[PDB]
Design a protein around this ligand. Structure first.
Ligand code: NA
Ligand code: NA
Ligand code: NA
Ligand code: NA
Lengths: 288, 288
C-alpha cells in the first residue's frame, strides 16, 4: 500500500505462532510483533497518539516545542512523530539512558537535557521558559490506556477473536496492559491478563483488577529467553520480549490443549547488539 | 493477521511519500520501506526464497547444513530462514565484516568461518567435507532476479501501477534491480531504471540493458542523505538508503510535475548506531 508518511505504518502488527518456544506447553503460544513497528517498539503507538490527540484538542500545532520528561522507560515515539509532523522536541531525563537510544533520539532532531524528580522539574521550568511549548508525559497522562483500547486491543480481537485464553504484556509505562485488558475483558471476561514485571537492574524500573497476575522476571531469565526467540523463532527482539515470553511459559502451563496464549513482543534487538546478543557480554554478566 | 512464522511477514513493504526530501524536485518522490522486513533488509527476500526454491527442487531438507559464502555484501536472510526452518547454517567470509552483523548472525545460530577467493574455496571444501551440506550463494545464483520479479516488482506494480516514471535501487548483489526492472519494463517499457552504485570504501563493493543509468555515490553524500531520511522523514534507515535517495534526487530532477519516482530503502539503522548516526563519527570521518 501507498501512504503519506511513516506514522501511518504504525500498528496492525502480525501475530506469529511460537512453534519451538511453545513445545513445552500443552497450549498454543503466539507472539504479537510490536517490535516490527517503524520506531522498533510497541511505544511507537503512544507517541504518535499523544501528538494526534493534543493536535485534535488544539493544544499544539506544528512548529511548537514538545517537552517530554522521561525516566528512560518511554520510547522514541514522541521524537519520531515530532520529526514527521514538524515539532521541535526536547527530552529531559536522568544521565542513566543508553548511547543507542540517545544517538537515535538526537538523529531524529530531539534535544536531550540530562539531569542528575529533577527531569520532571526541568520539564516544568522549560514549559514556562519556552514560548509555544507543551509537556507530553507518558506517565500520569491517563489517555495512555485509550490508544491501546482503540488499536492494540482491537487488533488482538480482530486477529484471534474470542478463542483467546491469555494475554501476557509489560506493565511499563502502563498504557498497553490497561487498554488491552479493558478491550479484551469487555467481550471475553474469562480472559487471563498477565502483567510482566522485570525486577532486574537492567530491564526493571527503579477487588477487580484488570490485570489478573503480575509475574516477576529477573534479567538472566529475560535475556536467555530473548536469545531463544532469536535462535529458535528468528524474532530479532530485545530483552523485554524475553521477559514477556518467559512469563508466558510460566503462566500458560495452566492452560489446556487447544487453548491459546498471546504474548506482546514489545522491543527490537537494535539497542542490545553490545549487550545480551553478544556471548562475551552474557558470560561477563554471569548469564552463561 | 495470524501467521505460522516470521518468514511469512517478509514482503508487502509499504511505500511512503517522501514529502520533505522531495521538496526540491518537481516530481513526487516515494520510498519503498524494505528496511521494515523482519531481518531489517530487502535481502530478507532472497535468503528465504533460496531455501524455499532448493527445498522445492529436493536439493535440501531440514537438518541439512547450508553453506553461505559471502563477501559481506549479502544479508542475514539465509541465517534467518535457516534458523526458522531448522537448518544448520555455516557462513564463510573475509575478516572485513562488522561486529553488529556478526553478533546477529551468531545469535541466529550461524557458524562463521573467517578467511584472510579463500571464502569461496573454503565453502567448496566444507561442501565436500560435511555430509548433507549444500552451498547457497547469492552471487552467480541466476535465480536472484526471479524472486524480485515475482514479489518486489509485482508489489511496485500493484501499489503504483503504470503511473510510475522512475525506480531507483541498488546494484548489489544484483537480484533486486534485474528482477524489478524486468517486471516493470514488461508492462511499462518507458520506465527509467536507475542503478545505485556506491563507490566509497564503507558502502561500496571492492544495446538494451534493463538498467538505464548507473549513478556513482560516495560515502559522505550517502550518509548525509541517510541523516536527512531519519531527521526529516522519520525513516530509521542505513547508509544504502541514503545512497539510493541521493541518486534519486539527482536522476528525478529530469521528471515533470505529476510524475512519480520510487526509491527502494533497502537497509535499517541497526548496524550504524556507532557509525553515521553518531555526530562524533560523522565529524571524525570529515563528513560534518
Ligand atoms: Na504496520
Ligand atoms: Na526565566
Ligand atoms: Na510484511
Ligand atoms: Na578431508
Amino acid at each position: 500500500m501507498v501512504l503519506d508518511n511513516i506514522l501511518q505504518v504504525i500498528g496492525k502488527t502480525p501475530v506469529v505462532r511460537l512453534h519451538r518456544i511453545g513445545q513445552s506447553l500443552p497450549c498454543e503460544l503466539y507472539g504479537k510483533c510490536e517490535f516490527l513497528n517503524p520506531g522498533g517498539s510497541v511505544k511507537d503507538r503512544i507517541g504518535a497518539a499523544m501528538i494526534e490527540s493534543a493536535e485534535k484538542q488544539g493544544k499544539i500545532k506544528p512548529g511548537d516545542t514538545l517537552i517530554e520528561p522521561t525516566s528512560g522507560n518511554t520510547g522514541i515515539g514522541i521524537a519520531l512523530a515530532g520529526a514527521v509532523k514538524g515539532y521541535r522536541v526536547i527530552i529531559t531525563m536522568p544521565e542513566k539512558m543508553s548511547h543507542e537510544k540517545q544517538v537515535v533520539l538526537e538523529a531524529l532532531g530531539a534535544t536531550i537535557y540530562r539531569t542528575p524528580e529533577s527531569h520532571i522539574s526541568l520539564a516544568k521550568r522549560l514549559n514556562q521558559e519556552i514560548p509555544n511549548s507543551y509537556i507530553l508525559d507518558q506517565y500520569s497522562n491517563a489517555e495512555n490506556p485509550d490508544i491501546h483500547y482503540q488499536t492494540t486491543g482491537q487488533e488482538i480481537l480482530d486477529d484471534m477473536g474470542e478463542n483467546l485464553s491469555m494475554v501476557v504484556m509489560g506493565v511499563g509505562t502502563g498504557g498497553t496492559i490497561i487498554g488491552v485488558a479493558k478491550k479484551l475483558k469487555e467481550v471475553n471476561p474469562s480472559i487471563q491478563i498477565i502483567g510482566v514485571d522485570p525486577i532486574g537492574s537492567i530491564l526493571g524500573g527503579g477487588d477487580n483488577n484488570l490485570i489478573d497476575e503480575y509475574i516477576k522476571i529477573n534479567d538472566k531469565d529475560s535475556f536467555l529467553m530473548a536469545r531463544r526467540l532469536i535462535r529458535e523463532e528468528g524474532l530479532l527482539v530485545g530483552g523485554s520480549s524475553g521477559s514477556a515470553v518467559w512469563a508466558a511459559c510460566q503462566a500458560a502451563q495452566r492452560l489446556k490443549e487447544g487453548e491459546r496464549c498471546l504474548v506482546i513482543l514489545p522491543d527490537a534487538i537494535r539497542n542490545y547488539l553490545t549487550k545480551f546478543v553478544d556471548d562475551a557480554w552474557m558470560k561477563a554478566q554471569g548469564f552463561l
